[PDB]
Amino acid sequence: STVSILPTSLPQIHRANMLAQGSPAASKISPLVTKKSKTRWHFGIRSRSYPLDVMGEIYIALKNLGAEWAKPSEEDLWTIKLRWKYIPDLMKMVIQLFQIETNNYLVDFKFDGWESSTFSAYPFLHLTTKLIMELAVNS
Amino acid sequence: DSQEKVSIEQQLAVESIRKFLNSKTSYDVLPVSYRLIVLDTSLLVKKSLNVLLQNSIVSAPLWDSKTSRFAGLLTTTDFINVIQYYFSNPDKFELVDKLQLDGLKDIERALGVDQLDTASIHPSRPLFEACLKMLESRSGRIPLIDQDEETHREIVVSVLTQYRILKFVALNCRETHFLKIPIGDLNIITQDNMKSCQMTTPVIDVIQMLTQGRVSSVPIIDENGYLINVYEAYDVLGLIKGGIYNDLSLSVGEALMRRSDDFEGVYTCTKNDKLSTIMDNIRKARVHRFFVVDDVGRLVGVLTLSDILKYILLGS
Amino acid sequence: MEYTTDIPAVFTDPSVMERYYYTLDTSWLTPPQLPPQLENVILNKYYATQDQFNENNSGALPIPNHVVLNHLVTSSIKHNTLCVASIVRYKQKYVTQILYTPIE
Numbered sequence: 338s339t340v341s342i343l344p345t346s347l348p349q350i351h352r353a354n355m356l357a358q359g360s361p362a363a364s365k366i367s368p369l370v371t372k373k374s375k376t377r378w379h380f381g382i383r384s385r386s387y388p389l390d391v392m393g394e395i396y397i398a399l400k401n402l403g404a405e406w407a408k409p410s411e412e413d414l415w416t417i418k419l420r421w422k423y424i425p426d427l428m429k430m431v432i433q434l435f436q437i438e439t440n441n442y443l444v445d446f447k448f449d450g451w452e453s454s455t456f457s458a459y460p461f462l463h464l465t466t467k468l469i470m471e472l473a474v475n476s
Numbered sequence: 477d478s479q480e481k482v483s484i485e486q487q488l489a490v491e492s493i494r495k496f497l498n499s500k501t502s503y504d505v506l507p508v509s510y511r512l513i514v515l516d517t518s519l520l521v522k523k524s525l526n527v528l529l530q531n532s533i534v535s536a537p538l539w540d541s542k543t544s545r546f547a548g549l550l551t552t553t554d555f556i557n558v559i560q561y562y563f564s565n566p567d568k569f570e571l572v573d574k575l576q577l578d579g580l581k582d583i584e585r586a587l588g589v590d591q592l593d594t595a596s597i598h599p600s601r602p603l604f605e606a607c608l609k610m611l612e613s614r615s616g617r618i619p620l621i622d623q624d625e626e627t628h629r630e631i632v633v634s635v636l637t638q639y640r641i642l643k644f645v646a647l648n649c650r651e652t653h654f655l656k657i658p659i660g661d662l663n664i665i666t667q668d669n670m671k672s673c674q675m676t677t678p679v680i681d682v683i684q685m686l687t688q689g690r691v692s693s694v695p696i697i698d699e700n701g702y703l704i705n706v707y708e709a710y711d712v713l714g715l716i717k718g719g720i721y722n723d724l725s726l727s728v729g730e731a732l733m734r735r736s737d738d739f740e741g742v743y744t745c746t747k748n749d750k751l752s753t754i755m756d757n758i759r760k761a762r763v764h765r766f767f768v769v770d771d772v773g774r775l776v777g778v779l780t781l782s783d784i785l786k787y788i789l790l791g792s
Numbered sequence: 793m794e795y796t797t798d799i800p801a802v803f804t805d806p807s808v809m810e811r812y813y814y815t816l817d818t819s820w821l822t823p824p825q826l827p828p829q830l831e832n833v834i835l836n837k838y839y840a841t842q843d844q845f846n847e848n849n850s851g852a853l854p855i856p857n858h859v860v861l862n863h864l865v866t867s868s869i870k871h872n873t874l875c876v877a878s879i880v881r882y883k884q885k886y887v888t889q890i891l892y893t894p895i896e
């Protein structure tokens with residue numbers, strides 16, 4: 338076949354041909370180097386405080402943002418079943434506190450549907466962004 | 477005797493490709509698990525550029541957190557608009573620097589460019605229908621959009637590209653081998669009114685050719701018509717990254733030094749090449765077009781992905 | 793279920809948790825241990841397997857665990873931008889929906 342890569346299109350040859358001609362830009366302009374850092378992903382947010390303290394910070398943040406929640410029982414103290422105002426108008430969330438290490442806890446956030454296989458998490462993601470920011474300020 | 481056989485095998489391969497396209501949905505093109513990068517509209521333009529470059533993508537759906545709805549696709553066209561606006565208003569550097577994605581429509585109004593009624597397809601629909609719609613996109617990207625089963629809101633599932641369709645075809649239809657008719661005998665190459673420039677042409681003029689001609693790239697030739705390089709809409713992303721205020725009156729040749737070292741190159745072919753070979757290249761590498769050259773390397777035409785799709789769908 | 797804006801007494805009044813301690817008869821007094829599915833090494837390998845298939849064409853595409861669906865994924869704030877995500881189901885396929893939003 339006669340399918341090829343045009344050699345003069347490759348950066349190394351193009352640069353060299355511009356340098357050989359004499360144009361100053363050849364020395365001064367450098368190629369774009371996009372350093373793509375390996376992003377570390379985590380579920381939810383970590384806290385170094387202790388259970389009752391953490392749960393207290395969350396509820397305070399929830400209250401100031403205008404959310405409502407169900408009364409928890411003794412078997413599910415570390416679970417928040419909340420509703421947020423933001424066609425169904427009220428978004429449901431489940432927030433769960435987990436223990437990692439002795440001094441380390443993870444706050445898990447879960448979308449739980451709407452109240453009046455194919456769905457958008459973006460309204461959920463937007464609200465959690467507000468919640469994480471509200472929490473970061475109070476700290 | 478021999479040209480009769482080549483012809484009927486080509487016909488069989490094409491009928492087979494078309495049936496495949498008629499039997500598959502856009503949903504089928506999707507990987508079993510994949511990522512969808514969406515930008516809030518209040519995000520800065522220059523940060524959105526970094527998000528694209530960091531993630532090795534060239535488009536991203538937009539999300540309006542105020543109205544809780546999708547606000548279209550950020551593409552290289554939006555970035556062309558910004559550079560054109562700045563070049564015409566170099567006093568407004570501060571506005572451009574602090575420009576947010578939702579401010580793009582103000583830039584559009586200031587330049588007088590059309591709204592652009594960007595298409596969409598329901599994933600459940602035949603792939604063949606998404607192909608027909610692809611012949612209208614100049615971006616080469618169309619959002620896959622469904623309905624949220626609870627909010628009834630219109631929502632983005634993915635972004636379909638022409639490359640991805642043609643690669644999906646190539647991977648699943650090895651009958652491409654029997655496309656042995658030289659592309660020169662098919663009348664699928666565009667040869668008339670070739671928009672081109674030279675190495676000394678200022679990059680801003682080349683950028684004007686992209687939107688004024690409705691083309692994704694501009695071939696770069698010497699005085700005698702030899703193909704040397706190309707300037708792509710994609711290159712604009714690196715051009716803004718490396719200083720807009722800096723490269724006001726820079727030549728295309730000079731601007732091309734900003735290209736990353738991982739640039740994969742410009743593909744060329746001749747009139748004697750076959751679509752079997754073309755699809756093989758698409759199968760194995762991201763190729764967006766094949767520039768047709770003669771026996772000595774002079775530019776005679778271009779065969780883009782849209783030309784190949786159009787042949788698959790509509791014929792010669 | 794009934795909904796209210798009243799913060800549960802156990803987090804605003806020391807008397808409530810104290811009462812629980814003293815009226816003993818165990819695990820409900822402490823938050824559960826983090827499930828192995830939500831560990832950050834499993835989450836990022838899932839990302840790396842998606843990357844290895846698309847950069848090096850090595851292996852197969854990773855199906856996520858059904859446990860982690862609709863749960864929030866986060867990363868460190870960079871350039872005053874919060875990047876959050878959530879793995880959701882679309883028909884029989886899986887979309888990691890990522891959002892970039894500016895913060896203050």
Ligand SMILES: Nc1ncnc2c1ncn2[C@@H]1O[C@H](COP(=O)(O)O)[C@@H](O)[C@H]1O
Pocket residue numbers: 613614665666668669670671672690691692693694695778779780781782783
């Ligand atoms: N620089 C160019 N000059 C003239 N025609 C072009 C150029 N680039 C692409 N085309 C043609 O314009 C149509 C759309 O181009 P594209 O958007 O690149 O697929 C195709 O039929 C191409 O063959």
